């Protein structure tokens, strides 16, 4: 009973067509700014990306390793940790996961920022799981 928990990132965007898109719907699972950054409470966790953005454009989107050393997904690659939490808002002393998209790839805009907190340790673990709509 319990042990498996997931954190997920939903991003939808809507289209000068090749400009800052107006429809931003960055979404963080189970996240309440007021409550504060979500903190994993389980031994195992998996990371996934969501194309809420409609596949109607040459535009493309990605999250690039930046301030944080550990890139998304690589995180799932059996990376150990002591404690971790995530919040859309910059968390002081936090890794920065730029959330960005490019029309086609020729042009780019700094649409989103995700920030994370690192706590060194061994209990928490990088983990892989598959894909389903839920």
């Amino acid at each position, epitope marked *: 009973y319990h042990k498996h928990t997931f954190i997920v990132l939903y991003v939808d965007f809507k289209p000068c067509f090749n400009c800052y898109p107006a429809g931003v719907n960055i979404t963080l699972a189970n996240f309440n700014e007021t409550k504060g950054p979500l903190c994993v409470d*389980t031994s195992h966790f998996t990371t996934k990306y969501v194309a809420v953005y409609a596949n109607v454009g040459r535009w493309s989107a990605s999250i690039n390793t930046g301030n944080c050393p550990f890139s998304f997904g690589k995180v799932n690659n059996f990376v150990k940790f002591g404690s971790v939490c995530f919040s859309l808002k910059d968390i002081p002393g936090g890794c920065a996961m730029p959330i960005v998209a490019n029309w086609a790839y020729s042009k780019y805009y700094t649409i989103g920022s995700l920030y994370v907190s*690192w706590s060194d340790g061994d209990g928490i673990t990088g983990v892989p799981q598959p894909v389903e709509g839920v």
Partner: antibody
Amino acid sequence: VQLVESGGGLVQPGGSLRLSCAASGFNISSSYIHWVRQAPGKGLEWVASIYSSYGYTYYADSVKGRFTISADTSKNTAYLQMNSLRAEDTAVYYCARWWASVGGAGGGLDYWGQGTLVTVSS
Amino acid sequence: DIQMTQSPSSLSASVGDRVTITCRASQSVSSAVAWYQQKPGKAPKLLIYSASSLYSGVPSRFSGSRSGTDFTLTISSLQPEDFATYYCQQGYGWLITFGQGTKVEIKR
């Protein structure tokens, strides 16, 4: 590098008052700052914390509207405003700091002020 | 949606003996665990963070450990100066809560 609670005393029920947290040694903007109450001969419970730089206000389920937190950077000092005080509120009030070696995550409360007493009675 | 239960409520023991205090994580968590010491009518004092992190000025005998949800604080040898109330805290720069706490007494 020390902290001092100030403005502790008595106020009558329904009164409102503000508390002073003096700091020495560090710029308050760089660290989280919390306030904790100690019920007389009872356990402590978390009240709220504030990060000056990003103006993050985080309160406890106990007192969303009842109290509010602030701090002035030029003052280099933290404030705590309270209203419509109730009998349960009567407690000792300590302000204190937070630090992490990792930085982003897991941390602790290192330094405390002496703490002041607040009473609500006629 | 997270808290902790601190056991025991209170205890006494002989001097230099081993003392264990635990907190069971109401809904288990990560490494946000911390233990503090408060002397009577005195300012609370920092002891341990994430079980394994001791601030400078902490004597060696104190130890903190994790066993899943149960978080243990162990003082190897009871010292008289140690007499006080001790509380366990789970949280980060945001949130946090406290357990009933355990005052420790010296049997002499």
